[PDB]
Amino acid sequence: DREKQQLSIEAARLYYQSDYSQQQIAEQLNISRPTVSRLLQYAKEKGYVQIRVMDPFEDLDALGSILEEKYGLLEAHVVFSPTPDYAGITHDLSRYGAEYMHETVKDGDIVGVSWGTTMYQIAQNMQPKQVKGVEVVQLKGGISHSRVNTYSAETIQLFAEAFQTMPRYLPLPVVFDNADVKRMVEKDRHIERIIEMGKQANIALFTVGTVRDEALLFRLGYFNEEEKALLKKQAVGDICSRFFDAKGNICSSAINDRTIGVELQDLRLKERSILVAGGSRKVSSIHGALTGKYANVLIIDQHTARALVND
Amino acid sequence: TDREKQQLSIEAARLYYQSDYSQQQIAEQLNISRPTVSRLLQYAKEKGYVQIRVMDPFEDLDALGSILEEKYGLLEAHVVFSPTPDYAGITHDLSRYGAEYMHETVKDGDIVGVSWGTTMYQIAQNMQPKQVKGVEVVQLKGGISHSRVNTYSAETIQLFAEAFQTMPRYLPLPVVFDNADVKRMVEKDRHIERIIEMGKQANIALFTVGTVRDEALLFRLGYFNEEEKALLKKQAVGDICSRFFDAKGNICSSAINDRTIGVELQDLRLKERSILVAGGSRKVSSIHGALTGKYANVLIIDQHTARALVND
DNA sequence: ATTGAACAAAATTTCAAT
DNA sequence: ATTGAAATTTTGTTCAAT
């Protein structure tokens, strides 16, 4: 009684799993084209072919709402990434970072920047704007040397150009050998306004770093091999090379007190402190940072965002 | 790459399908052109926004797989839909599934044996690159001096290697030696044996079954010297790795298969996953003899050939 | 219930413009 | 690149036709 059902199931499939024409189907079945159309209608009617309007948008909205409540943030943006490998996440996040900055930055904003290959990516997306009275400042200390390009210079430059301003560098190394040295530098007439502008910034954009032995800070030699072994133990991640713990506290003030850059606690004051991070290799650093309540805007992927809530 | 267009596009697709609205109609509510609406719908399908699934009695597909999954004692049986019953049409579709399966299957530190074949090469091309490490990929099948079609042997194993962040282990030997003694002491050469041994160590194996007709050039390259060509034609049903067998999956002539190069057949049964991709209306006899020989424990086959199998 | 020419409404897609 | 207009198939739909 049901050799028709089989045909309807057979023909309907060809027209959906082969991208076949109605007339393509009528050829092999040696039947009329109108008949084939009727068969397809019949299959839809009894539900041999069922159609679904999956919309991840809704999912992402709600997930964000949880992170907003969980860590008490102003904004949480969950960005869809098709892949959970680090690279794919980075790219998708980066491009959203760009868009957000473009939408967010208004005439007369004071914008603090950092460097990082993360940070560079967000910048690279064009994000140009006819904005006025905007200034852009370096928040993170620099290097003597590195095996990879830091892209530090170009990073802040591109930000500047895009905002019809020019860069305020912080022309200092990330770490001084001695704390007294560090104190006396930050007080210099010129240096101080740069740090002060750092603190004045109403926008701040940064990533959090990893603990892998492939970290730039580990490689470059401004840290004791002996102390790094101890420091790594107590430090989940870093923002601008100030290291925190699983509760967001400075793991070592001894070392932090000889580290250059705007101060972590300053971040809490800022009208928008924007963390972009993601990647399942980084989840440890993100929890610490949000616990420290250093960000009030979070940009994160759904892989990492899932791992943060469901834990 | 706009949040609004993704939202607007999906809403329109939702409207067109769910409430059964015409593109013209959708264009009314959205106050846009009819062509635009059509493009939006295409975009939604493209990014997988709208998903269409076809359901049926299990016989048609799925269980169609389980019945022989259990009949031949195979671990896995995958029946792939092909819109047509000719070889090319089937091969193409099987090939693409082959690629996907390998991508899902191959894990860090696998030993992967492959072969060559017009079949094998398409699976190879449709292979997806993968973030995997410690993987090794080895040649299981002997080679040729010459052929009228390109064997694609080299590129086949190369593409597999590249995709798995390893490099190729070739077997630099002819498929057949004139004399069995020659063959034996070649296999014992310290360099060669590492390769054959790695062949036996492989926990994954991927191969097709060449039919009697297919290896007519094996017949035609002066091997088997004909007095054996006859013996093989009538008896053998197929050939995996240019080794032959009969309908009950048994080496047809051990005399001949003792001067043949490649990873031994019986080794295939030992492997954690031995994956046969074959199908085709003209090629069922071979599959019959390969699955009976208990060589494969994973089968990838089309529905035309799969039904013809259950008709024994 | 059921074909299928012939017609008729419905998407596809090039063509031109912005 | 994008949007509509315009033409062309592509899907549906009346009609009993040869």
Question: In units of Å, what resolution does this entry have?
Answer: 3.7
Beta carbons of B206 and B112 less than 8 angstroms apart: yes
Q: Which residues lie below 8 Å from residue A232, measured CB to CB, with a gap of 6+?
A: A211, A218
**CB pair distance less than 8 Å for A9 and B56:** yes
**CB pair distance less than 8 Å for A54 and B48:** yes
* Integer-rounded Cα radius of gyration of chain A: 27
Beta carbons of B217 and B151 less than 8 angstroms apart: no
CATH number of A56-309: 3.40.50.1360
The first and second tokens of residue A257, run together, are 């007190």
Beta carbons of B151 and B170 less than 8 angstroms apart: no
Please report, for residues A111, A175, A181, A186, A266, the alpha-carbon distance to residue A196 in angstroms, rounded to integers and kept in the order given: 12, 19, 19, 10, 10
Task: List the single residue in B with minimal CA-CA distance to A56.
Answer: B49
* Chain A 2-41 contacts with nucleic strand D (CB below 7 A): 15, 21-23, 33-34, 37-38, 40-41
Distance CA A278, CA A289 (A): 12
CATH number of B63-309: 3.40.50.1360
Task: List the single residue in A with minimal CA-CA distance to B17.
Answer: A51
Which residues make beta-bridge pairs with B245? B238
Q: Which residues lie below 8 Å from residue A153, measured CB to CB, with a gap of 6+?
A: none
Distance CA A212, CA A219 (A): 11
Beta carbons of B126 and B98 less than 8 angstroms apart: yes
Q: Which residues lie below 8 Å from residue A44, measured CB to CB, with a gap of 6+?
A: A12
Beta carbons of B238 and B211 less than 8 angstroms apart: yes
Burial call A255-286: b when 16+ CB within 10 Å, e when fewer:
bbebbbbbbbebbeebebbbbbbbbeebbebb
Give the residue from B3, B43, B55 with the most A CB atoms within 10 Å of its CB, the best one to mutate. B55
Using the Cβ of B54 and the Cβ atoms of chain A, whether some distance falls under 8 Å is answered with yes
State the alpha helices, DSSP H only, in A220-296: 225-234, 253-256, 283-291
Distance CA A180, CA A200 (A): 25
Using the Cβ of A102 and the Cβ atoms of chain B, whether some distance falls under 8 Å is answered with no
Other C-beta atoms within 10 Å of A293: how many? 14
**Which is the CATH superfamily of the domain at A4-46?**
Homeodomain-like (1.10.10.60)
The first and second tokens of residue A119, run together, are 């940070």
Please report, for residues B76, B117, B214, B269, the alpha-carbon distance to residue B299 in angstroms, rounded to integers and kept in the order given: 6, 17, 20, 13
Exposed/middle/buried for B47, CB within 10 Å: 0-12, 13-18, 19+? Answer: exposed
User: Is the distance between the Cβ of A108 and the closest atom of strand C smaller than 7 Å?
Assistant: no
Question: CA B36 → C1' D1, Å?
Answer: 14
Please report, for residues A208, A244, B244, the alpha-carbon distance to residue A264 in angstroms, rounded to integers and kept in the order given: 12, 9, 73
Beta carbons of A205 and A114 less than 8 angstroms apart: yes
Sequence-distant contacts of A150-155: CB under 8 A, at least 24 apart: A150/A115, A150/A216, A151/A115, A151/A117, A151/A120, A152/A115, A154/A120, A154/A123, A155/A113, A155/A115, A155/A119, A155/A120, A155/A123
Burial call B142-162: b when 16+ CB within 10 Å, e when fewer:
bbeeeeeeebbbebbbbbbbb
Which residues make beta-bridge pairs with A261? A140
Question: CA A34 → C1' D15, Å?
Answer: 14
CA nearest neighbour of B100 among B126, B125, B68, B72: B126
Q: Which residue's structure tokens are 């799969």? A: B306
Q: Is B80 helix (H, G, I), strand (E, B) or coil?
A: strand
CA atoms within 13 A on the CB side of A290: 27
Which residues make beta-bridge pairs with A168? A137
CA atoms within 13 A on the CB side of A304: 29
Distance CA B156, CA B124 (A): 6
Distance CA A8, CA A302 (A): 40
Closest nucleotide to B38: CA versus each C1': C11
DSSP A281: G
Q: Locate the domains of chain A by residue range.
A: 4-46, 56-309
The letter for the amino acid at A291 is T
Report the CATH architecture of B3-46.
Orthogonal Bundle (1.10)
CA nearest neighbour of A48 among A17, A71, A81: A17
> Looking at strand C, which nucleotides approach a protein CB closer than 7 A?
2-6, 9-14
Distance CA A244, CA A68 (A): 21
